[PDB]
């Protein structure tokens, strides 16, 4: 199964699960600088792509 994996498979699987998806975030401690949820969500895609 490992030998079957190449670059194309990685690009497709990662796009399937990461790109333009809503994450769940958990923060604890001095997290005043933790970005707003909208900014995190906007960080999940690229305008250049």
């Amino acid at each position: 199964r490992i030998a079957e994996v190449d670059a194309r498979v990685v690009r497709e699987v990662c796009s399937k699960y990461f790109y333009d998806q809503c994450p769940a975030v958990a923060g604890f401690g001095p997290i005043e600088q933790l970005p707003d949820y909208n900014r995190i969500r906007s960080g999940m895609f690229w305008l250049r792509f």
Binding site: C22, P30, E32, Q33, Y37, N38, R41
Partner: protein, 75 residues
């Protein structure tokens, strides 16, 4: 100027947020919004209205008086 992480000190406060693609943008727009609008209207009518009512009465009285004064009187 100032920056996040240097504003003030806060302890023991939890915040729960939901994604915008998971919820409605207009969930109770009329079923809840209209009662709140009436609440705010009632809450501010007595502060805002009486000055402008006094203006309306001075406007109408002054215009009526100016109109009557331009008409002549016998003798």
């Amino acid at each position: 100027g100032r920056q996040f992480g240097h504003l003030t000190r806060v302890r023991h406060v939890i915040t729960y947020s939901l994604s915008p693609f998971e919820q409605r943008a207009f969930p109770h727009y009329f079923s809840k919004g209209i009662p709140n609008v009436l609440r705010r209207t009632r809450a501010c009518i007595l502060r805002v209205a009486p000055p402008f009512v006094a203006f309306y009465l001075v406007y109408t009285w002054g215009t009526q008086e100016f109109e009557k004064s331009k008409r002549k009187n016998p003798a």
